[PDB]
Write a protein that holds these residues in place. Structure first.
Motif, PDB file in Angstrom:
ATOM      1  N   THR A 207      -2.163 -21.647   3.032  1.00 24.85           N
ATOM      2  CA  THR A 207      -1.110 -20.559   2.666  1.00 24.85           C
ATOM      3  C   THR A 207      -0.817 -19.675   3.948  1.00 24.85           C
ATOM      4  O   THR A 207      -0.011 -18.915   4.182  1.00 24.85           O
TER       5      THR A 207
ATOM      6  N   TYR B  69      -4.508 -10.368  -4.271  1.00 22.97           N
ATOM      7  CA  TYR B  69      -3.774 -10.590  -3.330  1.00 22.97           C
ATOM      8  C   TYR B  69      -4.145  -9.729  -2.299  1.00 22.97           C
ATOM      9  O   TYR B  69      -3.907  -8.395  -2.252  1.00 22.97           O
TER      10      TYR B  69
ATOM     11  N   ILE C 120       5.363 -19.564  -2.465  1.00 20.06           N
ATOM     12  CA  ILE C 120       5.710 -19.777  -0.980  1.00 20.06           C
ATOM     13  C   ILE C 120       6.554 -21.080  -1.089  1.00 20.06           C
ATOM     14  O   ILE C 120       6.572 -21.903  -1.781  1.00 20.06           O
TER      15      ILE C 120
HETATM   16  N1  LIG Z   1       3.523 -11.680  -5.448  1.00 25.53           N
HETATM   17  C1  LIG Z   1       3.402 -11.784  -4.047  1.00 25.53           C
HETATM   18  N2  LIG Z   1       2.191 -10.837  -3.607  1.00 25.53           N
HETATM   19  C2  LIG Z   1       2.108 -10.615  -2.148  1.00 25.53           C
HETATM   20  N3  LIG Z   1       2.682 -11.703  -1.366  1.00 25.53           N
HETATM   21  C3  LIG Z   1       3.704 -12.492  -1.834  1.00 25.53           C
HETATM   22  C4  LIG Z   1       3.858 -12.583  -3.185  1.00 25.53           C
HETATM   23  N4  LIG Z   1       5.116 -13.411  -3.218  1.00 25.53           N
HETATM   24  C5  LIG Z   1       5.389 -14.041  -2.187  1.00 25.53           C
HETATM   25  N5  LIG Z   1       4.445 -13.338  -1.009  1.00 25.53           N
HETATM   26  C6  LIG Z   1       4.265 -13.432   0.221  1.00 25.53           C
HETATM   27  O1  LIG Z   1       5.422 -14.258   0.920  1.00 25.53           O
HETATM   28  C7  LIG Z   1       5.116 -15.511   1.355  1.00 25.53           C
HETATM   29  C8  LIG Z   1       6.121 -16.430   1.260  1.00 25.53           C
HETATM   30  O2  LIG Z   1       7.314 -16.314   1.697  1.00 25.53           O
HETATM   31  P1  LIG Z   1       8.237 -17.120   1.318  1.00 25.53           P
HETATM   32  O3  LIG Z   1       8.067 -18.557   1.680  1.00 25.53           O
HETATM   33  O4  LIG Z   1       9.560 -16.672   2.215  1.00 25.53           O
HETATM   34  O5  LIG Z   1       8.713 -17.402  -0.043  1.00 25.53           O
HETATM   35  C9  LIG Z   1       3.541 -15.597   0.745  1.00 25.53           C
HETATM   36  O6  LIG Z   1       2.631 -16.572   1.539  1.00 25.53           O
HETATM   37  C10 LIG Z   1       3.058 -14.448   0.856  1.00 25.53           C
HETATM   38  O7  LIG Z   1       2.784 -13.725   2.107  1.00 25.53           O
END
Ligand SMILES: Nc1ncnc2c1ncn2[C@@H]1O[C@H](COP(=O)(O)O)[C@@H](O)[C@H]1O
Length: 493
Positions: free
Chosen positions: A375, A389, A292
């Motif tokens: 989160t 997840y 994130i």
């Molecule tokens: N490996 C993953 N599996 C599922 N969701 C993910 C994963 N990596 C990122 N996300 C999603 O993307 C969000 C982060 O968004 P961002 O801050 O734009 O990187 C997280 O809170 C998740 O909801």
């Protein structure tokens, strides 16, 4: 310690050490143009002088609007060397979004090409960056900001120390060295690019720039990664589907890759089995990364194994060393192991808060004394401590006399072997008759009927959670930040 990552407390000191130690090694390549660490170090020092003359000073935020390329990397280093933080402007932003980011961040200069109607006046154009390229040979501290990346828009300032923590944690999972070659691919506005850039530089490796000519198709992508001896690539699960199909159909040799690192989207086995069938799981290794913007790019990793391919859920694996975790219920208390709750994270990778949003920050970063980040993601702990997840935590709706967890319906649809993506929404059938519906994406080479998806869901969920109709799409529509556009889905219906 001899380790430059452990020994340096900010990214500029890290880069300078890695460059001074072996300056002839290649830091950056664009087609056949190889830029050594020494050359990059001098070039970015020259650009930093140009920024100083535009009044950039420590603590400033400097906007950056450029496609990922050599000049953009030089610009980032120059900004950081000035003690300032960079604020990337996505080239595909709507004008109003770019206007807000510039206003909200208090950006006082921009490097690159201003968007139409840009309100920032003090500009170092891309051409001025390039002019500094072959000229000769105060710095930030750990708690100084390195970048502000905007999410959803909320600005997230991430400090030098946050990024160093990520970099120090990576070797608990990855075997990287200065002989790797990392593809720079992602928009500078996505924190995946922070990882592509600093994964390479922190280890003295080469960052390979994807040429503009190769920007469009997975065939072009493969041609470049193979031609240029790329060993590390970072992809969304979505991009990986296209890459797999092109590699398999094209007879390409992918075995030069050492790692494919996934991020950004839920990863399930139907997205992986075709690559594993053709290429196995060793060369390259495939590793799912969850993270994130607020917690500095990556939080947990799961290296893909045969066991992953044999189950129908999404496993994001174990948290990096910096992290503490909780899985938290509605009542605010920890769930019992195995139960689904909201992931809370602590530790050195947490951002300080949001930019100028005290209200949001207090809510999203509570103290419990340990400071956490909520989160907004639902997970569940497996028996061994790895996390599964589940979905976003804001997806409960009320419909037809029930509370309905849309994330549970999406997970259930995702368990189908021939489905690679799914979103559940509500739509109006006749006047006062709203019902769940599901748009989904079929695995390449398959076609599944709505009747078949209905039969699948009947075995998993009670009837009040059954989508009433199914709509296959050649991919789900995405927002700016690459998330599913639930409004655009509604329009597709
Ligand atoms: N490996 C993953 N599996 C599922 N969701 C993910 C994963 N990596 C990122 N996300 C999603 O993307 C969000 C982060 O968004 P961002 O801050 O734009 O990187 C997280 O809170 C998740 O909801």
């Amino acid at each position: 310690t001899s380790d430059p990552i452990a020994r340096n407390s900010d990214l500029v000191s890290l880069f300078r050490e890695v460059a001074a130690t072996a300056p002839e090694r290649t830091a950056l390549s664009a087609e056949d143009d190889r830029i050594s660490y020494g050359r990059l170090d001098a070039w970015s020092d020259a650009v930093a002088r140009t920024l100083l003359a535009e009044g950039v000073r420590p603590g400033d935020r400097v906007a950056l609007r450029m496609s990922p390329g050599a000049e953009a990397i030089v610009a980032i280093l120059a900004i950081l060397k000035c003690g300032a933080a960079y604020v990337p402007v996505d080239l595909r932003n709507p004008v109003s979004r770019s206007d807000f980011i510039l206003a909200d961040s208090g950006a006082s200069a921009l490097i690159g090409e201003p968007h139409e109607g840009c309100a920032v006046t003090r500009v170092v154009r891309t051409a001025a960056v390039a002019e500094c390229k072959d000229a000769e040979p105060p710095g930030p501290g750990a708690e100084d900001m390195a970048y502000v990346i905007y999410t959803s828009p909320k600005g997230v300032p991430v400090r030098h120390a946050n990024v160093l923590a990520l970099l120090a944690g990576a070797p608990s999972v990855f075997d990287f060295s200065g002989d790797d070659r990392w593809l720079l691919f992602h928009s500078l506005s996505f924190d995946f690019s922070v990882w592509e850039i600093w994964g390479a530089f922190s280890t003295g490796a080469e960052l390979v720039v994807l040429p503009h000519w190769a920007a469009r198709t997975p065939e072009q992508y493969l041609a470049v990664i193979i031609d240029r001896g790329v060993t590390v690539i970072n992809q969304t699960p979505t991009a990986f589907l296209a890459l797999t199909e092109a590699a398999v159909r094209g007879g390409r040799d992918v075995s030069g890759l050492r790692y494919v690192i996934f991020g950004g989207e839920k990863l399930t086995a139907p997205m992986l089995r075709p690559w594993a069938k053709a290429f196995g799981l060793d060369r390259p290794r495939l590793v799912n990364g969850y993270g994130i913007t607020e917690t500095t790019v990556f939080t947990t990793f799961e290296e893909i194994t045969e066991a992953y391919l044999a189950q129908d859920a999404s496993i994001i694996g174990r948290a990096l060393p910096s992290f503490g975790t909780r899985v938290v219920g509605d009542d605010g208390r920890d769930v019992a192991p195995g139960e689904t709750g909201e992931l809370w994270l602590s530790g050195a990778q947490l951002a300080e808060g949001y930019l100028r949003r005290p209200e949001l920050t207090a809510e999203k970063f509570p103290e419990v004394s340990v400071r956490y980040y909520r989160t907004g993601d639902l997970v569940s702990e497996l028996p061994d401590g790895r996390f599964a997840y589940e979905g976003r935590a804001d997806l409960q709706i009320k419909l037809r006399g029930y509370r309905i967890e849309l994330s549970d319906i999406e997970t259930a649809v995702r368990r189908h072997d021939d489905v690679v993506d799914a979103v559940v929404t509500v739509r109006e059938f006749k006047p006062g008759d709203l019902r769940l519906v599901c748009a989904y994406v079929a695995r390449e080479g398959s076609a599944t009927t709505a009747r078949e998806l209905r039969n699948h869901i009947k075995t998993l969920l009670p009837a009040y959670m059954h989508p009433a109709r199914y709509l296959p799409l050649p991919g789900l529509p995405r927002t700016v930040n690459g998330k599913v556009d639930r409004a655009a889905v509604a329009r597709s219906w």
